[PDB]
Design a protein around this ligand. Sequence first.
Ligand SMILES: O=c1c(O)c(-c2ccc(O)c(O)c2)oc2cc(O)cc(O)c12
Length: 362
Amino acid sequence: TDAAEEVLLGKKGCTGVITLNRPKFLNALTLNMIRQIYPQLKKWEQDPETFLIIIKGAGGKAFCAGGDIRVISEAEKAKQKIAPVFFREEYMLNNAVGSCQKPYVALIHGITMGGGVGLSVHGQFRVATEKCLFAMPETAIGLFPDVGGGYFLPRLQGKLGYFLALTGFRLKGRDVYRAGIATHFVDSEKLAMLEEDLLALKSPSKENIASVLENYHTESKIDRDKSFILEEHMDKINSCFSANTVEEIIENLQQDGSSFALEQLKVINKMSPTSLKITLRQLMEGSSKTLQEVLTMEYRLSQACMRGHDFHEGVRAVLIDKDQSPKWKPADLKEVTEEDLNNHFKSLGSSDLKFAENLYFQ
Ligand SMILES: O=c1c(O)c(-c2ccc(O)c(O)c2)oc2cc(O)cc(O)c12
């Protein structure tokens, strides 16, 4: 047996199967994996013998915990940078998933966060199990909810996505479905059969695929009639998170004064202030952008963030030392100025992320 690849690509029946394959690192997405997945997705779109693409994670704990931001941060320490290529090609793959010309099913069993969400939420079908653990945890690490977070987050109900984006709130299991992040829910004990039945389909249409998913979804039992964990908080979320500045959101939470609001206020106050301001503007702007436009914006954001202090500090606090004790700079929201913010959003000119060759554009 040769050494295992970081992602497996296979053809089984009518289906192309992508298996994220770094389970010891929670299947975190690398440039190597992106560069295998992206061209394969494009080939399968044009392959008349491929009717379905499934993405899944190896190991049963994680679908994918994120893009591999540890390695990106390490690479920032010296001259062999990875960030310019990584974010560009990652975002190109999120767009490819979102515009996929064949049915695309993501089996989001297990931890599904950040980059892992980018590989799933934009696809046509996302199947959660009771073990699905969703978050966009980027404001805790000095980044922002990228991989198209600026597109999908504002499009969740009310201001749910703004709440998720700013606080990194975790949703588990059937709540991932209730939130609209998963399209379907299956108990994990039946996931293997669901996979098998999809793979066994002969020349399936999108409708054939949808039928299989529906049939499993209907019969799943775990939390079947449980309400969405955030339903009782949706009015206050919709109110508090309607403001145009982070300072106003924090003020609204304080004035609401409920246990939940004060808990989430506490969390927000531990997030990178720069990250918070970026994230709010990103979602507000993203609310009126296409996925491509959003990704173009996020690419600018990603490169600006590499030039700041907080990303490297967040990776240290969260991923390396795990002391959950980041010292942000600036430490106060007041010191995140309008000009600083505007600088992150500036065009990169000919270095911008674009989705066609130059001759396509005026
Ligand atoms: O992007 C992220 C990421 O990749 C991982 C991660 C953690 C453990 C692993 O073993 C791994 O491979 C990845 O954690 C995170 C935690 C955050 O709060 C925010 C993030 O953005 C990430």
